[model samples]
Target: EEKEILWNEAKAFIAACYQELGKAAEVKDRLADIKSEIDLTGSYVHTKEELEHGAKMAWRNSNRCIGRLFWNSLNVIDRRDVRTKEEVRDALFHHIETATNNGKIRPTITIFPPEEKGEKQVEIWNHQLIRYAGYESDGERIGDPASCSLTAACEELGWRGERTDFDLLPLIFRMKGDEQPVWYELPRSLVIEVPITHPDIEAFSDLELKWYGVPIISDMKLEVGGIHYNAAPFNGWYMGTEIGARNLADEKRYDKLKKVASVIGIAADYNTDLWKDQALVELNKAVLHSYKKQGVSIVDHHTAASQFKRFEEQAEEAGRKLTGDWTWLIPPISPAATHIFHRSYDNSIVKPNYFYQDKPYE
Candidate 1:
């Protein structure tokens, strides 16, 4: 019964792809290969096409992503053969440069060796391959507060930067059995960052606020047909509000609301929440305008919402129910203005998806 179920699911999944996409030629060949694997090995191995589609499907099922309209375009790097720590680092470095694309960022994933046969798996130590370094000394904080934990781990690996707010953290990784890990400092020239600027307020530039080009999530596990690629680091171009309303604007992050408000000549009126709201709007606008000006790929709240609605229709039409978490699906700014705020999703979990695993460092 178990083997029959596995065999049937394998055929059904491949058939569904062909039916929805009409890729009859490729799907037919791929299906034969899958069936051959199942007959010999009791379970089929996912091919490159399957891996790519599975990754996109995972993105589609992701509840937090407001930008699922572009899910079908994600580029997958099949690094399932990468074993050693050095190979892992190179793949990561390559992923950063390739995905950045000199501001024309591409959504990409680098799938690393899996954990199997009681062997250790590889893992990246940073949340995002490109992230700020946080330094805490004498009750003072320098750089991003969100990075403090990872920054300490990086420091332990002999990475000592200037502790600047925009210092690009090193790419650190380790194989499961190693006593120590390897590290690679991102090149100053390769790490592309956009300095934040507001249209009306010159003070925004003086603040020295900036963000990296790509947001590579390195800790998520890619489970394609239960074959876990534990180190499949993936990235997508950021939504404007992600950097503005959340990353820089959040109190736990840069905590710049009060500072920005004071700079733009807004009275410090926390009681009525006037200055806070104004600073957030201008800050979000800065993020949107900055990315657009540089030709970097970023979606605004309105565009993101419109695309999500389109995604819902296409997904249902493709014979897949769109599952999502409403709280996460809704844009942080202007909830009522977008179509997604009214439309609902099932929020059910699905496979061939990405899941947040344990942190690389304890």
Candidate 2:
């Protein structure tokens, strides 16, 4: 029964992936081998060629991502052979360096070990390979509030942090058979950060705001051909609003809107003043300006939304059904300003996709 289920899932992925890659001619033979292998062993392994395109397909099918326009360009690093925890840690570091690419952030993913016999062999506890540590002290929150849970878990495991607003969190992960999560501090040189500044506002530079160049998501499961890759961390260039409008502007995260408004001489009058909205626009502008000045690959919400339109066109041209989460597709800074907010999308999920998995750290 397990064999049958595995074969069906594999067949669906192989057919779609091969057809998309113009390898339909060889799909028949590949499916035969896959079926035979699954029938005998209850599972089959993905070839390096299969793995590469499969990862791209997963990105193409990602419903929540706005940058799917470049899904075909994802760099998939197959690291399924690494057996030890040390090797996994090293590979993650390499992924950061390669993806950061000295500010010209490249879209990349490092696929670690897949599940063996329905059990996970490797898991990364951190939500992202690179993220700030958060802490609450004396009724005040330091760093990103979104990171509080993971930061506390890291501290419980003896991971010490400097408690700064932008202190880098150590990588926490565990290999199969390991009883506890191993924490590794990433070398400071590997982390590329951009200090946000505005083109017209001189005081903006004094705010001392900064953000990491690459966002490497590490905790999601990459399911390809019915196989679960629990340690596949992927990254893409950020949209300016993701940093400026949400990360910094959100009250629950950095709560920087008031600070930004104050820096620019905008008085706080909740009933009459549009200070928050004005601050949000300036923050996003600063993010875009700084990232561009630093040569980091980033997109403004306007450009990102336009790119999404191109993706929709391409999907329609190819007769593929494009899906998206409206809440995510619409930019936070100015939802109505973008075409995305004006239309609707199908939110149904497709196979060969990235999925949220249960956190490795309870």
Candidate 3:
């Protein structure tokens, strides 16, 4: 049953992939080779060219991202042949440096080995390659609340953090059949951090807020042609609202709205003050301004939506129906004003796409 499924998916993927690549004439021969390999070994390996294009296809098929207009530009690095846990750690570090691109933030993914007999060969524990540690001290939360569980898990594994608001978490992972999880401290030099500051508000700089340049998602599984690259870490440049309206402003996150409101000299009462609303706008503006001033590539929510509009037009022009998660596609701030909120999306799960996976630690 597994072999049949693999062969069928491989056939469909190769046919469509080759056809789109204008190598339609070679599809039949390629499919035959893939079937034969699967029949003998229970699975087939994707050639380097296939791996690259398949990852790009996965990005194009992602429903939540508003930055799909640059899907074709994803730089897929092949790391299937890498052996040992140390090699995997080095590959991940390299991924961070390469994708960071000194703040230019290239869209990139480093694909590890395919699953064996449907079992993951490697599992990356971090949600992103770089994330802040969350902690509770003296009846107060010290960092990102969303990271509390993972942070606690790291502590249990003998990983100690400085318990700061923005302490970088180490990379944690484990390989199949290994009894121990591996953790590595990510070099601070590789991480490009932008200190948040407002264009007009000098008080905003006093908050001492900052964020990482790139968001390299490490936990998701990249499924392509029935092959699961279980350790693929991929990234795209940030949309300002991700850091501003959601990450920093969300109550469960950094919860900086009240402080920002105080800085702007506004009452933070949610009832009629609209202080949170004003603070949200200023925070997002500061995020954009700071990233741009520091030479980091980031998109404002308005421009991100406009680019999504271009993606829709291009998909339509290509005679392809675009799928999206409307809830996710719409910007967190001022959704009604954005074009994404006005239209509904299919929201269907597509194949050869990125899928959420269970966390490695309890």
lDDT of 2: 0.89
1-362, model 2: which lDDT tens digit per residue? 56677788898989988897788999999999988888778889999988999899999889989999999899999998899888988999999999998888889999988998778888788988989999998998899999998998999999888888999999998878878889999899999899999999999988899999999988888899988887899999998888998899788989888889889888977847888888988898889999999899999888888999999999999999999999988888779999999999999999889998787555
Q: Rank the candidates by lDDT, best first.
A: 3, 2, 1
Model 3's TM-score against the true structure: 0.98
Q: How close is candidate 2 to the true structure, as a TM-score?
A: 0.97
lDDT of 3 by residue, 113-148 (tens): 988887878888999999999997688889899999
Which scores higher on TM-score, 2 or 3? 3
Evaluation by lDDT, superior candidate among 1 and 2: 2
- Separate clash counts for every candidate: 0, 0, 0
lDDT of each: 0.80, 0.89, 0.90
Best by lDDT: 3
RMSD, each candidate, Å? Answer: 2.9, 1.2, 1.1
Q: Pick out the ten consecutive residues of candidate 2 with the lowest summed lDDT.
A: 1-10
Off by over 4 Å in 1: 1-44
The 10-residue segment with the lowest total lDDT in model 3? 267-276
RMSD of 1: 2.9
Instruction: Write the residue-wise lDDT of candidate 1 on 240-268 in tens digits.
Output: 88898899988778988888887788888
